[PDB]
Design a protein around this ligand. Sequence first.
Ligand SMILES: CC(C)=CCC/C(C)=C/CC/C(C)=C/CSP(=O)(O)OP(=O)(O)O
Ligand SMILES: [Mg+2]
Length: 341
Amino acid sequence: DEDLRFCYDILQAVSRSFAVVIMELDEEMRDAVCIFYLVLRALDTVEDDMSIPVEFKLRELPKFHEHLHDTTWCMSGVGVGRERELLERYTHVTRAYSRLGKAYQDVISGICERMANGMCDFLTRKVETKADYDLYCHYVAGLVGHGLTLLYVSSGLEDVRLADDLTNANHMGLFLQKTNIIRDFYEDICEVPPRVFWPREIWEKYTDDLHAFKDELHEAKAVECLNAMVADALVHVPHVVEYLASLRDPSVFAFSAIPQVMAMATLSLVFNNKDVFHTKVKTTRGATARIFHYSTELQATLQMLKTYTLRLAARMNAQDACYDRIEHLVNDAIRAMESHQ
Ligand SMILES: CC(C)=CCC/C(C)=C/CC/C(C)=C/CSP(=O)(O)OP(=O)(O)O
Ligand SMILES: [Mg+2]
C-alpha cells in the first residue's frame, strides 16, 4: 500500500487544506477521493505552468485521462515543488487508481477528461463575460462537485437520487472557487504573467484597467467591484444549503460542509474589505478549529452559515452601491437556511 501512502503524502504537501478535510471520509471513500484529487491536481499543474508552451498543454491535457490506465506514464519537466514530484512519480497514483472499484475509476476518468478539455478552452482565451466566469468555474470546480456527488452515490453512502440533478453540486463547487478567486485577487494579479479571473463584464463597470485596484487612488472603485463580486458569489448559497441538507451520511456531510462554511467565513471577511487589494484576508486559526468542530450535522452548520451570513450583511451601509443588491441576496440565503431549521 506504499502507493496509497505516497498519494496521501503528496496530498498533504500539495494541499494542506483539502488534506485535512478529506480525513473526515471513511477509508474506502477517502482513497477514491484522494486519488481523484491528485489526478485533477496533476491537470492543474500542467495548466498553471506558465514557463511551458501552450501547444504543449493543448497536446498533453486532452489525453491525460488515458494515462490513468498506464502505470508507467509520468511527466518530467513540469511544475514547481511537490507538484513537480506528483507528475514525475505519477506512477503511484495510477497504481492506486487501478486498485479502485470499477465505478470509482469511471467517475474519475470521466471528470478528468471533461475538466482537461475545459481548461484547454480557457488556455486559449480570457474570461470576459459572467457566462465565461461561471463556465470556467464549472470546469475547474463545479465538476469536482459533480465527481464527488457521483462518488458518494457509487459508494452507497448517499441515495442514488443525489445524482439526479447535479446543478446544486455545481453550485457547491462554484461557491468555493469564487470565494477563493475573490480572496486571491492581489496575489493572482501580482504574478508573472498576471493571472486574472474576475470577469470583464463585472469589472469594466468600475475601471478600464483591473491593475488600477492595486492603487489606493482607486480604492473606492476597487471596493465597489469587490462587493459586486461578493454579490455574484452569494447567488450560490441557497443552493449550497439545499445540497448540504440533502446529505444523510455523517462522514460525507462533514467532508462536504466544512469547506462551504469556511468559504462563507472568508466571504464575510473579504466583503467591503479594502485590505483584499494588498494582502490575503484569512480567518483565524481558532475560527477554523471551531468550524471543523461543529460542522458535523446540519443544524449546527446552518447556524454557523447564518452567523457568518449575518456578519457579512452587518459590514455594509445604505451608502454603498450594493446595499440593495446584497440585501436581497442575504435574505435569500438566510431564508434558505431558516427553511431547514
Ligand atoms: C462537495 C461538492 C459538491 C463540491 C466541492 C467542490 C470542490 C471540493 C472544489 C475544489 C476547488 C478549489 C476551491 C480548489 C483549490 S485547491 P485546496 O482546496 O487544496 O486549497 P487552497 O484553496 O489553496 O486553500
Ligand atoms: Mg488553474
